[PDB]
Design an enzyme around this catalytic site. Structure first.
Site, short mmCIF file in Angstrom:
data_model
loop_
_atom_site.label_atom_id
_atom_site.label_comp_id
_atom_site.label_asym_id
_atom_site.label_seq_id
_atom_site.Cartn_x
_atom_site.Cartn_y
_atom_site.Cartn_z
N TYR A 1 2.24 33.47 59.82
CA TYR A 1 1.07 34.15 60.37
C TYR A 1 0.47 33.42 61.58
O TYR A 1 -0.69 33.63 61.93
CB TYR A 1 0.01 34.34 59.29
CG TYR A 1 0.18 35.55 58.37
CD1 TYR A 1 1.26 36.42 58.50
CD2 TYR A 1 -0.76 35.81 57.38
CE1 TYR A 1 1.40 37.54 57.65
CE2 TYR A 1 -0.65 36.91 56.55
CZ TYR A 1 0.43 37.76 56.66
OH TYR A 1 0.51 38.86 55.81
N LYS B 1 11.35 32.31 48.92
CA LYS B 1 12.57 33.07 49.21
C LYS B 1 13.61 32.13 49.82
O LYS B 1 14.21 32.40 50.86
CB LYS B 1 12.27 34.26 50.13
CG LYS B 1 13.40 35.28 50.28
CD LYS B 1 13.47 36.26 49.10
CE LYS B 1 14.68 37.17 49.19
NZ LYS B 1 14.69 38.20 48.11
N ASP C 1 10.32 38.44 45.27
CA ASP C 1 10.48 39.83 44.84
C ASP C 1 10.38 39.94 43.31
O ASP C 1 9.66 40.81 42.77
CB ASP C 1 11.78 40.44 45.40
CG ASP C 1 13.02 39.58 45.20
OD1 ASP C 1 12.99 38.49 44.60
OD2 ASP C 1 14.10 40.06 45.66
N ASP D 1 -0.92 36.10 50.94
CA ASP D 1 -1.65 37.30 51.32
C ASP D 1 -1.28 38.48 50.42
O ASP D 1 -2.13 39.10 49.74
CB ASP D 1 -1.33 37.60 52.79
CG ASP D 1 -2.15 38.72 53.36
OD1 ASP D 1 -3.31 38.90 52.90
OD2 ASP D 1 -1.64 39.41 54.28
#
Lengths: 334, 334
Positions: free
Chosen positions: B124, B173, B206, B230
């Site tokens: 971000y 991830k 996920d 977030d």
């Protein structure tokens, strides 16, 4: 007539493919089947997890129905699905999430959505990844292009038109990641103007995930970039019980591959216990793709009705039926 | 004694801060209050949305309790929360998600988790964002550092120890984004070895989102990188009814800011209708942070018990009580 490549796969793969092909014949989908090897059986018998004859079968037929495959561990084998995505430029990863009765919960039903995930660019690229020699600083990149965004959003809208759905929601974080996610959103708005009867919605990704748990019924088709689509499709699987019943497709311009999301479950292989519903629903996706939406709907409602009646269900769902018996109960309600 | 900076804010801000300070006094938290201006009131009266005297108050006291603020639109004003994060290096964005009775649903209760989100690096950042002149190609970047990962994971484990929690789950991830998310996970494993009685869990993002909708009860503290945090914090808000009751904190080495997540709701300002629970729960977070966990728990259980008894609830929850009356009903059960 039309010919499709059929990969019977490993573990429970052959059993559930037998059942699926039975139902497809009962539908009179008009298909003929050409068999190809991948996974363990290919490795043993042709020297390669993914032989060139199977790739050529898929190239020729442009449509494949694929049972689960087993890839050995510890030998440096490469992901089969990744190899196919690179080979065929499979840019649309398409995951339906639909409520079915008596299938475990987060209950209350009424979920009926599809997540369309861009699968060739975004934040999941190999390029751009490096760690400094001293281990202090890691970098990774994301790339979003006009071409890649245009094709994934066009796919979503074409899917809406082809299956009778009514809304496409583009999911983004363009307020913060202005360059890449902002370009995706700009392109999505532009494409939406070409489909006036499909409602277009824009939603920020964090709010989207909140709304998916509060009222998933509000969504129809969701389209988004690679990482966001990974996350959202697995969230949505959790709304409808998990991955045991989940279908999936991976679609490009000249090839499309349809499957169950689950693995090959070798522990119950050959025992007639495997639930064929996920692969059946993958075959429903295939039917939508090749232009038989009425038969895809007949299949999905027959599955709903068979589950409602508790007719010949497999043990994962508390029944004492077997794979083929469950398939025949489904086919009787077509 | 200890002094905290109090920002009464805009809209319903003053009413709910009055109620919160009443409950804090009833707890005998031993605090004294120093008032500072931010938002509309500052802009009108001191020339700046965020005056240097307010920054100096926060610098001196190192702890602030902040009501919602209004920022005008169309005038190029910068985000107040962003300015504070840059000013004070507020690297931990901390969001509790807890089930309360009679507060809307996804019901079944038993949710009691905290999302710890790294808030200074990750995906971000403003740096690294560019679109080519012809508009065809956009790029964005992510940076993960050993220093930034170490401090966010240490915060999560210290929080566990300071509040009696038992598990930290690091979410990643690293299988795909090997450089940045992989460095985060490597650092998280290393830090976990310094906290032997806190269970350490690793989970892919996920799968984490799927599990949060299937069984959110399994999670305690979740720690993760900026974008992932977030997403997960807003998902979790949806599990417990939404943002109307959500507290939040933003914490750095020498300053910490505690608040309600919701906005200033100017339409009902001054009418005594506003629900003070979110800001009360932000004050509970503050109490945990400054070393009074027993009082934070007393406050949370009094809120639970008041909601169970339906004693003087505000109209958003179907009652006919008012902000201060609801606060007094809570304080009576301390």
């Amino acid at each position: 007539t039309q010919t499709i490549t059929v990969i019977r796969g490993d573990g429970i793969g052959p059993e559930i493919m037998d059942a699926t092909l039975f139902v497809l014949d009962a539908l009179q989908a008009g298909l003929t089947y050409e068999y190809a090897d991948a996974g363990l059986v290919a490795l043993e018998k042709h020297g390669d997890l993914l032989p060139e004859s199977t790739l050529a079968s898929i190239t020729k037929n442009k449509v494949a129905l694929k049972s689960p495959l087993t890839t050995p561990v510890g030998e440096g084998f490469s992901s089969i699905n990744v190899a196919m995505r690179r080979k065929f430029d499979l840019y649309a990863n398409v995951r339906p999430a639909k409520s079915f009765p008596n299938t475990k919960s987060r209950f209350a039903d009424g979920v009926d959505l599809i997540t369309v995930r861009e699968n060739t660019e975004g934040a999941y690229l190999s390029e751009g990844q490096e760690v400094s020699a001293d281990g202090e600083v890691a970098v990774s990149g994301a790339r979003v292009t006009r071409k890649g965004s245009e094709r994934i959003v066009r796919y979503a809208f074409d899917l809406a038109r082809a299956t009778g759905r009514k809304k496409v929601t583009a999911v983004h974080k363009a307020n913060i990641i202005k360059s890449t996610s902002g370009l995706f959103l700009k392109v999505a708005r532009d494409v939406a103007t070409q489909y006036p009867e499909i409602e277009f919605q824009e939603m920020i990704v964090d709010n989207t995930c909140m709304q998916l748990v509060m009222r998933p019924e509000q969504f129809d088709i969701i389209v988004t970039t690679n990482l966001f689509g990974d996350i959202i499709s697995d969230l949505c699987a959790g709304l409808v019980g998990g991955l045991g019943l989940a279908p999936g497709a991976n679609i490009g311009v000249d090839a499309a591959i349809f499957e169950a999301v689950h693995g090959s479950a070798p522990d119950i292989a050959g025992q007639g216990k495997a639930n064929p519903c996920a692969l059946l629903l993958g075959a429903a996706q295939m039917l939508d793709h090749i232009g038989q939406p009425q038969n895809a709907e007949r299949l999905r409602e027959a599955i709903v009705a068979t589950l409602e009646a508790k007719d010949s269900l497999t043990p994962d769902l508390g029944g004492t039926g077997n794979t083929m018996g469950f398939a025949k109960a489904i086919a009787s309600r077509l």
